[PDB]
Amino acid sequence: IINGEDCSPHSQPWQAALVMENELFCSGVLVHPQWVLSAAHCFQNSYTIGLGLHSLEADQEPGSQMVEASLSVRHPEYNRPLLANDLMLIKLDESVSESDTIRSISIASQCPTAGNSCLVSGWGLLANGRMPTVLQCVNVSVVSEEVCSKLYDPLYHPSMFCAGGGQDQKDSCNGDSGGPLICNGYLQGLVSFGKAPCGQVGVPGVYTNLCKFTEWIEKTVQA
Amino acid sequence: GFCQRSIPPICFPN
């Protein structure tokens, strides 16, 4: 997260850390007690998932869990066309008993529109080029589909939307993929991709457009 | 120039 700050501890209780050999490679979002959304480009043959976390380096905070997940499924149209349909569902090997610090979040029942006020969180790169230990949070605003399609020419697809791009240079970055973009209090997107470097003036980040996938998600959950 | 924002990221020629 570029130009954010430490999140208030446990204020984003749906945040999931995806780690391998205790090293984070992506985040995800808890959407049901047994189900974590993430970017399809974060797919692995298995996962260790940190839930209820604030710090990655600290001792087990009260309420935190490290849970295994051995099953996941990418959207059938992922990367067709390139970068599009960037979501997958990870099924936890055990359902989590939701608690004060581990909670699911619902997906928005409305698609993004320019001006929507959002928050993105993650453990990805900071403005200073370092990786944080503590979960970071920053505010970004949705821009219009036309802005997104111009900026991300030639690869804009309706499975994507854009947020950020302000003169404030607030953005997601490497390591934030799969994490939540919460707009008006609902899960609106997952961190997906952007231009390098992150945090350029006038260049928003790109997020998976979850309002387009609610039927696929729930069909998969219920199968 | 586009990169999928995992760490390490997945970057493309554009």
Name the residue facing B1 among A131, A177, A195 (closest C-beta).
A195
Distance, in Å, from the CA atom of A198 to the CA atom of A107, rounded to the nearest integer, reads 26
Per the rule left: phi > 0, alpha: psi between -120 and 50, beta: everything else, A155 is alpha
Q: Are A2 and A170 in contact (CB under 8 A)?
A: yes
Is A75 assigned to a binding site? no
Q: Resolution of the experimental model in angstroms, please?
A: 1.1
Residues of B in contact with A173 (CB under 8 A): 5
Kindly list the distances between the CA atom of residue A11 and the CA atoms of A94, A135, A155, in Å, as whole numbers in the listed order: 23, 10, 34
Distance, in Å, from the CA atom of A121 to the CA atom of A180, rounded to the nearest integer, reads 6
Kindly list the distances between the CA atom of residue A123 and the CA atoms of A48, A57, A82, A181, in Å, as whole numbers in the listed order: 16, 11, 26, 14
Q: Are A3 and A138 in contact (CB under 8 A)?
A: yes
Sorted by where each starts, the structural domains of chain A and their CATH numbers stand as 2-13+105-208 (2.40.10.10), 14-104+209-218 (2.40.10.10)
Q: Are A18 and A43 in contact (CB under 8 A)?
A: no
Task: Identify how the structure was determined.
Answer: X-ray
Nearest to A202 by CA among A173, A161, A174, A169: A169
Name the residue facing B7 among A24, A83, A205 (closest C-beta).
A24
Kindly list the distances between the CA atom of residue A13 and the CA atoms of A54, A61, A115, A117, in Å, as whole numbers in the listed order: 9, 13, 25, 19
Amino acid at A113: T
Distance, in Å, from the CA atom of A202 to the CA atom of A204, rounded to the nearest integer, reads 7
Cα torsion A90, A217, A117, A143 to 10°: value is 100
Token pair for B11: 């970057």
Instruction: Give just the sign of the alpha carbon dihedral A170, A173, A176, A178.
Output: positive
A156 touches chain B (CB under 8 A): no
3-state secondary structure of A132: coil
Distance, in Å, from the CA atom of A113 to the CA atom of A207, rounded to the nearest integer, reads 13
Kindly list the distances between the CA atom of residue B6 and the CA atoms of A26, A204, A210, in Å, as whole numbers in the listed order: 5, 17, 18
Residue in A closest to B14 by C-alpha: A195
Nearest to A185 by CA among A38, A35, A14: A14
Tokens 């391998």 map to which residue? A20
3-state secondary structure of A93: coil
What residues are paired with A181 via a beta bridge?
A120, A189
Catalytic residue numbers of A read 41, 86, 177
What residues are paired with A65 via a beta bridge?
A51
Distance, in Å, from the CA atom of A139 to the CA atom of A5, rounded to the nearest integer, reads 10
B1 touches chain A (CB under 8 A): yes
Distance, in Å, from the CA atom of A195 to the CA atom of A148, rounded to the nearest integer, reads 12
Is A61 assigned to a binding site? yes
